[PDB]
Design a protein around this ligand. Structure first.
Ligand SMILES: CCc1oc2cc(S(=O)(=O)Nc3ccc(S(=O)(=O)Nc4nccs4)cc3)ccc2c1C(=O)c1cc(Br)c(O)c(Br)c1
Length: 276
């Protein structure tokens, strides 16, 4: 039994998952997010209570308004860096692809459906058929090259084209389509390591773009499990609470429910076991 397994059982029998999440909420530092609250940036935010910090937000270079609801989450100890962003709005899809191009991003990880519970959680920012999707505001076009439909997720091969220079880039779109938290981390871990197998999270590429609806809940679960697993391969005894609080310095409110926190503990334990 490892230290993480000992702690996981202690929280389970003592039923201390909600006070632990309350501790993480109370110890979370607040950072200024002034740019997100500008009146001109109101239509660029999906939710009023979700904003990127000024010190870690991703800037759209050489644009009139450089703002996008996206945060660069850097973890130097794990040599990992993700871009956690919101589900693009119909008017911010052009900015979403401008960010992907400027940051040299290789893959996009989508952990939500287009509609969920009678509500649209994300705009259709990529084409579903052979028709080209134009984004004249930033000068980009997206074409669907291939699609691999699996049981719980779908992988779309996309072509991001700079319509002004003709340069094209292949983007791997990993779309997890069956997020309820899941009762078992087997499906989530196999989806995460399929993203790992593509080499998209490797340092020779730009930061991968992780996003759900708000980009803090399910995206925080994906980033926390992946980062903690990398830190375990380095032989380091990790403090999952401290790792999560450190990532919360780059984007507010990572992990939204105690169940998401408990699922992150399960995915880290089962993920490290599958390597053994
Ligand atoms: C670490 C990623 C990962 O973690 C998982 C966890 C489960 S689980 O929740 O059922 N838990 C589990 C399942 C099996 C074991 S086990 O260690 O007893 N068996 C095996 N380990 C490696 C190959 S067979 C230990 C824990 C299932 C599947 C996976 C899984 C994968 O699907 C997976 C594993 C590898 Br290695 C890989 O290269 C890729 Br791609 C995906």
């Amino acid at each position: 039994p490892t230290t993480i397994e000992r702690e996981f059982e202690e929280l389970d029998t003592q039923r201390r998952w909600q006070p632990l999440y309350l501790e993480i909420r109370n110890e979370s530092h607040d950072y200024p997010h002034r740019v997100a609250k500008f009146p001109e940036n109101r239509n660029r935010n999906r939710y009023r209570d979700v904003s990127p910090y000024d010190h870690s937000r991703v800037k759209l270079q050489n644009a009139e308004n450089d703002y996008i609801n996206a945060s660069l989450v850097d973890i130097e100890e794990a040599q990992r860096s993700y871009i956690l962003t919101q589900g693009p709005l119909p008017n911010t899809c052009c900015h979403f692809w401008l960010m992907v191009w400027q940051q040299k991003t290789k893959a996009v990880v989508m952990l939500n459906r287009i509609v969920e519970k009678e509500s649209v959680k994300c705009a259709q920012y990529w084409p579903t058929d052979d028709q080209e999707m134009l984004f004249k505001e930033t000068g980009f076009s997206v074409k669907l090259l291939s699609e691999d439909v699996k049981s719980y997720y779908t992988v779309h091969l996309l072509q991001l084209e700079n319509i002004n220079s003709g340069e094209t880039r292949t983007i791997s779109h990993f779309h997890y389509t069956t997020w309820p938290v899941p009762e078992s981390p087997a499906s989530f871990l196999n989806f995460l390591f399929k993203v790992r197998e593509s080499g998209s999270l490797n340092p020779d590429h730009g930061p991968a773009v992780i996003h759900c609806s708000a980009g803090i809940g399910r995206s925080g679960t994906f980033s926390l499990v992946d980062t903690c697993l990398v830190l375990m391969e380095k032989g380091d005894d990790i403090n999952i609470k401290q790792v999560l609080l450190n990532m919360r310095k780059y984007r507010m409110g990572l992990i939204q429910t105690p169940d998401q926190l408990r699922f992150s503990y399960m995915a880290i334990i089962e993920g490290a076991k599958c390597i053994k």
